[model samples]
Target: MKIEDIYQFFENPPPTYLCQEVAICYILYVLLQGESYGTELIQQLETEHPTYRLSDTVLYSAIKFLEDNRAITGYWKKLEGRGRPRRMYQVSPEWQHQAEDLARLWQNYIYVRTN
Candidate 1:
């Protein structure tokens, strides 16, 4: 209907929503650096890749999976200027090596998707 707007379609592509597979790996990717909370997990992805997104639905499920497997552990902490303590997560020492390998998958994942 509008020939002038055809190029606009490709200029901005839709965001890639993370599935459980990627979400799990991504969780480890960040946790390897330090602890993180549920909401922060999604925010980090948007901050890092504006075109990529994660949902709380998928995130919690991924977190649960990791928790059940002992890949990570959760603790409550209060942050500056924030009300109430939020649950923070860190990688388990025994799972550190395995987590590193899985975290690398996150990088490999986006690479193929973007390039």
Candidate 2:
């Protein structure tokens, strides 16, 4: 390896993939604000976090986990312009308290990395 390669690594760091645990918290954090879809979830993470990414396999699994636990509910939403109705998710009212608490975990995880 070369010295320049090492500098380049930090200059444009590799993206960090969120684990299922973090993915769970992240979904809650965003859903608390507004409804979202699978594509939007992945895109929003890259946009908001910039240096982070969420793979399809991991993301879908996280969604299933949340759905199974009844922390959120899914429904089809018509987009302003779209080929198909997008499946959207929203946080359940009954779980809002715990949802917010868990969302905080995502905030703290990202916060720690920024330092």
Candidate 3:
């Protein structure tokens, strides 16, 4: 698709659950890099997937659900450049395969025909 087509396609936001599912996949993808905080995930979503705008509450809520199900684990961390501690999360080894599959699925599934 051309740049204009891309822009026009997202003129209306995607379904919320669709966005959330992709968000879940993306969170796991980033966690593969290392531990991350909610705000970092939010930034990544905005930076890498500009088509979708995700709120802090939605991101944290998904994190909470994943934490509850043991798909990921959370803790606190302080950065040298930052003042306050951040809530950091790591993807559990057991969920590695599932995470990989979800990420791959979204990567493949995102290119649907908008027409």
Candidate 4:
């Protein structure tokens, strides 16, 4: 193998759980504010934080997991002036404290800069 290839491989490793974990944190934060739909969530993140663009599969998968675990609850709602209904979600009242835990974990998770 070429030396450059080896360097590139080491430099750009596969994604870890950080993305999913951060996505969960964002979902919780948004839900705490109020109810929201998948499209709205995607739009909000893309508009407010361009770097946090998540694929539909990833976002919906996380949403499903959160719902299964009772962290959030979802239902179908027809938004105003919308021709179709969408699945909306809200944070579970009992699980609100978990957002603080996620916030703490994400806040402390840092990488040491290598010179």
Q: Of the candidates shown, which would achieve the greatest lDDT relative to the real structure?
A: 2
Per TM-score, the best of the predicted structures is 2
lDDT values of the candidates? 0.93, 0.95, 0.74, 0.73
Clashing pairs in 4: none
**Candidates 2 and 4: which is better by TM-score?**
2
Give the lDDT of residue 88 in candidate 4: 91
Residue 25 of candidate 1: its Cα lDDT? 97
Candidate 3 per-residue lDDT over residues 2-85, each given as its tens digit: 898788767965533335666777678778779899888877666665655567766877787788889998888888899999
- In the range 1-115, model 4's lDDT, one tens digit per residue, is 7999888877875333226766777677777778999889888876755434766777888898898899889899988899999999988888889866764553344221111
The lowest-lDDT stretch of 10 consecutive residues in candidate 3 is 106-115
Q: Estimate, for each residue in 59-110, the C-alpha lDDT of model 2 and write its tens digit.
A: 9999999999999999998999787898999999999999999999999999
Instruction: Give the per-residue lDDT of model 1 (tens digit) for 10-108.
Output: 786668899999999999999999999998999989998889999989999999999999989999999899998999999999999999999999989
lDDT of 1 at 93: 98
